[PDB]
Write a sequence for this structure.
């Protein structure tokens, strides 16, 4: 369900969008 996105929520939590960082690297 949340998988394949859950990893990427970690990206959201690390300030991805805000910094311009690539999704789960």
């Amino acid at each position: 369900e949340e998988e394949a996105v859950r990893l990427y929520i970690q990206w959201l939590k690390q300030g991805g969008p805000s910094s311009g960082r690539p999704p789960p690297s």
User: Anything to note?
Assistant: The CA atoms of residues 4 and 14 lie 17 Å apart. The radius of gyration is 8 Å.
